Amino acid sequence: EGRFQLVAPYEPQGDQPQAIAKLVDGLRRGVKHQTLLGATGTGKTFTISNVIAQVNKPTLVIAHNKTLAGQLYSELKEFFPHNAVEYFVCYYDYYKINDEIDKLRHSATSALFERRDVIIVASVSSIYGLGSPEEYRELVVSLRVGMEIERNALLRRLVDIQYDRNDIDFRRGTFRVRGDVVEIFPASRDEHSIRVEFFGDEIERIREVDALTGEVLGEREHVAIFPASHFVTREEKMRLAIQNIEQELEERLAELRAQGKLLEAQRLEQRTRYDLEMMREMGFSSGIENYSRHLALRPPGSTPYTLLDYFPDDFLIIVDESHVTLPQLRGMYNGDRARKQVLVDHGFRLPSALDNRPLTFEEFEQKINQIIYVSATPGPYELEHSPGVVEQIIRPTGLLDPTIDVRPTKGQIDDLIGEIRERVERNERTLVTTLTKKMAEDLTDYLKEAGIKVAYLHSEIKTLERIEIIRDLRLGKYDVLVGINLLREGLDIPEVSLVAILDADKEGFLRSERSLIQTIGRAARNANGHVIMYADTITKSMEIAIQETKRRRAIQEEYNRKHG
DNA sequence: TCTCCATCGCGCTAC
DNA sequence: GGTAGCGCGATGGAGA
Ligand SMILES: Nc1ncnc2c1ncn2[C@@H]1O[C@H](COP(=O)(O)OP(=O)(O)O)[C@@H](O)[C@H]1O
Ligand code: NA
């Protein structure tokens, strides 16, 4: 039940003090919804880190993608080195890798019950279904030295919380027994296992151990062993659960036969039986999450348990890039219901599998205690519910928001080519946005023809190779990058002095108030930052973006002359 | 009611 | 009875 200790070589600067203080004040006044309107490049992760430290609550931060999530996580481990900073997302291949991520998920949920100083960076996997956090906590095996317990009953418990007996391939989520030593590999650890040495019905010693080399690392007075699955139930309840699944199965197979669908019924039966055979062995299976209703014995159509429930009631939520993350959350349920419904109709799953689902937005709302939305361009939900906004526009470095010229489309490419050439001579980079992948590739060709070092960047390119291209631009291998909608949230490249927005009047999600400001922001990390919008008209979106950027530059200039 | 891009999750379908 | 690699719905925001 510890305390956050913020570790930074610097202290709040710019308008971070007023931002940190207004947020902390609102949290202490019990304000449910708050918005931090923080321009790109102002120290937002540091700002938030200060708020978290001053209210000292377990906090959940939700990001809309994992590149950002991973960045936030690495940064928050830096700022809070002696605190529990965790990561709760699911599988991806840009940071085995699959087991590393399952390990962190268990490390996240266990940390919530062990200590108070916890920060969990998460994707929308945070609103997907888990098993009861009550069952998970009460099934924890709490081991103390000189404790009256039978080696007998310890092993009974471990199996029921999903550790596999395995004397040979001793990996995480397993345990092995040699004579009087039961050795355990917690699901939250990748390197350290637990040695538990018995003498009759008494534990004589407990040792933290490097599982690979056997190097004893030290002693332990006590140790808590959490379950190796988030969908754990008591063996007591499995007997009735398997009955209720069997009953659900026959009813469903009758539905299928009464509509023909013999191929679907055979498919369903084969699969359910296999899962049932496994449930009478241990308790788990391949797709165990789909039997959550029956396993937890809960009323049908119940609200699922999520990561939010594993948090204490007085927790804080930070929504990063809220203008994008909130719409992501909102549409998850209907999409899920639809994909699951096709599986039930084709005999891949029982209808009870619909209860294994993500929260609705309404359900999510009710699980919120206190929340802070963080966006340079917050959406209508955030503004509607928050009492005004906490504006953070003075960057700590004093870097200004860029200037924005509007130029005609006629002769635009040749204008841009000329403009790029100037930047090459000043050892500066350029970013261009177009409307499609095709146009991006076509333009990249045309620039290569004109003696410009150029490469494209869009969703067809895999994440690993994107890192390379972003590095190459920085190193000066490329001078220009042409994209569509990846020159956005979280692309921090200070070598870029020019952003060129082609088809700036082609209104829609690619050219809205929100996306324009976000794109403009890529030129705010440079002291000569400049933006050019090629267009024959100034759309309502362009108007607002130019207007807001002009206000920020003027205000920032006003600050810089005052403070040297 | 479709398009443009880019993201998440899940889970079938081939290695 | 092991897993990476696709395909799927929803979302922003307008045009058509
Ligand atoms: N209060 C501060 N004093 C000095 N430097 C800071 C402060 N806050 C942030 N920084 C640094 O300034 C740089 C730019 O800020 P950054 O945190 O990237 O802004 P954002 O994350 O909002 O885009 C970062 O490398 C960060 O380490
Ligand atoms: Na909209």
Residue numbers in the entry: 2 to 96, 114 to 582
Manuscript text:
Both UvrA and UvrB expend ATP to form the preincision complex, which is believed to require threading of a β-hairpin element on UvrB through the DNA duplex. UvrB is classified as a member of SF2 helicases on the basis of conserved helicase motifs (I-VI) (Supplementary ).
If the UvrB helicase domain underwent rigid-body movements similar to those seen for other helicases as proposed previously, ATP-dependent domain closure would force the F-loop toward DNA, perhaps causing F527 to intercalate into the duplex stack, which may function as a “ratchet” to facilitate unidirectional translocation upon ATP-hydrolysis. Indeed, in a structure we determined of UvrB (S91C) bound to a fully base-paired DNA duplex, F527 is intercalated into a sharply bent DNA duplex; furthermore, the crystal structure of the analogous complex containing a F527A mutation revealed substantially reduced DNA bending (Supplementary ) and increased DNA disorder presumably due to the loss of “ratchet” that seems to lock the duplex DNA in position. That F527 intercalation is important functionally suggested by the reduced incision efficiency observed for the F527A mutant UvrB.
